[model samples]
Target: GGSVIVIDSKAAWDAQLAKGKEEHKPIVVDFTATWCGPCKMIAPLFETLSNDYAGKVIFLKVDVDAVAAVAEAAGITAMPTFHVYKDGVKADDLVGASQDKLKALVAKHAAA
Candidate 1:
């Protein structure tokens, strides 16, 4: 029913975190950067997953270059890092552009 939420500021990211907790919705975040090659490779897959999960999970994208504060707050040390959050806390994480792994992350948490 929707697409990923592109978080451009720390405030927006924080607001989503609050909303996730308030609504009891799981969140999947794609941490990426423009200069990252692997991030580009996984971008499409991440978009697909967002559509697949739709209302079941809240999908988000944070560009490290655009929003360094959000990335730093999430402790993102690597590009193309994906994080699964349940109840406002990090539940699972993936570091690379593995389609299966990203799918599984969304599937498992979406069911929660």
Candidate 2:
């Protein structure tokens, strides 16, 4: 959880997943879209969060169009949807650009 994993393609996203799988830590995935206004709004906040929870949380930013397959598989219906993966599986998710919810989810899963 040293820093956020910035993904721009399927290969990159898959590579990060492989690393996350090997490390065995909860992942907080921010599914964002390029043209989504809300997604643009939360970008910096998420970046800041990636630092605050450093060494404890694995924050990843996923561009929906860039990695459409991953987003579709995750059932993403919103632009700034936050998906939390625990033990290499989807545990929970939060939609929209809510900072409080993002922190809450990170606090819950960053433990292990």
Candidate 3:
């Protein structure tokens, strides 16, 4: 299975935002935990979408339990908080792992 690039530090998150600005690729941030069953289920779908939407988006994952600071910075109160960034700025956010919701979020933010 393909793996998602995990961002575990504030520095990595900053670097990703910088890169997203440089590349003009929308950043898709997934905040999850090992115990989150929904997170596990959605992760593969997120990876698949990354492949299908290659060049148009960037997928990032952060384990909330492991990277508490990053999650705190984002004010993530729940497991599997998904945020979309455009031009290094947060453009949208979603909670949970509904496939249809995630697809719609991507379609709305994905660059042409």
Per-residue lDDT of model 1, residues 5-100, tens digit only: 989888898899888899999989999999999899989989988887788889989989899887887888877899888777888899988888
Best by lDDT: 1
TM-score of 2: 0.87
Residue 56 C-alpha lDDT in model 2:
72
Per-residue lDDT over 1-112 for candidate 2, one digit per residue giving the tens place of the 0 to 100 score: 4577878787876777666678887778899888999888888888898898887778888888887888888888867999877666788889988878887878887774
Query: Positional deviation of 16 in candidate 2, in angstroms?
Result: 2.1
Residue-pair clashes, model 1? 0
Tens digits of per-residue lDDT for model 3, 7-70: 8788988998998899988889889899999999998888888888777788889999888888
Task: Choose 1 or 2, whichever is better by lDDT.
Answer: 1
Off by more than 4 A, model 2: none
* Candidate 2 whole-model C-alpha lDDT, 0 to 1: 0.81
Candidate 2 lDDT score at position 13: 69
Supply candidate 3's per-residue lDDT for 31. 90
Per-residue lDDT of 46 in model 1: 91
**Candidate whose TM-score is highest:** 1
- Which residue runs does candidate 3 get wrong by more than 4 Å? 1-3
